Amino acid sequence: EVPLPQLRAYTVDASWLQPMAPLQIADHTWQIGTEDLTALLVQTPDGAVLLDGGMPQMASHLLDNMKARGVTPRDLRLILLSHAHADHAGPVAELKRRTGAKVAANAESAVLLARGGSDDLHFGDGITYPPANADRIVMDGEVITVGGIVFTAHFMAGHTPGSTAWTWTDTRNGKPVRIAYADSLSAPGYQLQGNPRYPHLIEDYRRSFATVRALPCDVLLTPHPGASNWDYAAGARAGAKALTCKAYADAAEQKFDGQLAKETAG
Ligand SMILES: [Zn+2]
């Protein structure tokens, strides 16, 4: 009659794919992704770190922005991830091939990255990307230092088992700026209660709200800028309206509680 459906590509709003020039956040820290996907370059006298890469088709754009910053493929030492979904870890395999970068991630993020986002607890095989291997496994609270920028991992399981907030201290005007790159605290279409694939999902999210609320956090950034009220297209005012970590956690918790109630009603 009636063939099986074609494969459906993971398609997203144009703004998520809209290239932007590097936007400086602090002395060593730049947004180099797109208007609606964060990809943070931290540049040090001992090499560079990338936190997230956005979608798979962003690899070349990231490399161009790195070059604009004076960061060559060899200079890129480390890729860190918020979580290993296609829209944040998309280009990681390609980046590894084209640069000196090695990936550090927790065990959950590493296994999900190694399967290219397939067999996702919630999306199944709906949202996949090229698989990549982690080079270093990090534990909760573990520190990775590059050129005296100290990144601390704070596990915030929920959006994915391996979701992580990365914190570090940069400077702006000779004063310290405690940057918190907090992962998503959404649960887009997730079954929250009694989920056989994630039995403690709710407890994990609750704990993650508390973790996020308590982060060292002069400046919050999030994988989608809109989540923390960043506007990467607003130039000098990009971070003006940004939420605190406390407000971001509170909003997320409130939305989660609403989603729980809707699920019970559904
Ligand atoms: Zn995600």
- The domain that holds 183 is classified in CATH as 3.60.15.10
Distance 169 CA to ligand 1 centre (A): 25
Q: Which domain holds residue 149?
A: 1-266
Is 87 part of any known ligand binding site? yes
Number of domain units in the chain: 1
22 CA to centre of ligand 1 in angstroms: 23
User: Does 83 participate in catalysis according to the annotation?
Assistant: yes
- Could you say which DSSP state residue 235 is in? G
Residue whose C-alpha is closest to residue 192's, from 204, 177, 209: 204
159 annotated as a binding-site residue:
yes
C-alpha span between 76 and 135 (Å, rounded): 14
Q: How many Å apart are CA 194 and CA 260, to the nearest integer?
A: 11
| Residue tagged active-site, from 36, 75, 154, 190 | 190
Q: d(Cα 38, Cα 99) in Å, to the nearest integer? A: 19
CA 85 to centroid of ligand 1, rounded, Å: 5
Backbone φ, ψ for residue 75 (5° rounding)? -75, -20
The one catalytic residue in 36, 87, 129, 205 is 87
Coil, strand or helix: which one is 148?
coil
State how far the alpha carbon of 208 is from the alpha carbons of 97, 105, 158, 179, 201, in Å.
Answer: 33, 18, 7, 18, 10
DSSP code at position 34: B
61 catalytic? Reply is no
Buried b (16+ CB within 10 A) or exposed e, 162-189: bbbbbbbbbebeeeebbbbbbbbbbbee
Q: What is the amino acid identity at position 231?
A: D
Check whether 200 is labelled as a binding-site residue.
no
Does the annotation mark 28 as catalytic? no
64 is in an annotated binding site: no
Q: How far is the CA of 174 from the centre of ligand 1 (A)?
A: 35
Centroid of ligand 1 to alpha carbon of 9 (angstroms): 16
200 tagged catalytic: no
Q: Residues near 211 by Cβ (< 8 Å), separated by ≥ 6? A: 154, 155, 156, 165
- Cα 40 to chain centroid distance, Å, stands at 9
Q: Is 28 annotated as a binding residue?
A: no
Instruction: Please tell me which residue in 88, 120, 198, 232 is annotated as part of the active site.
Output: 88
Active site residue 154: no
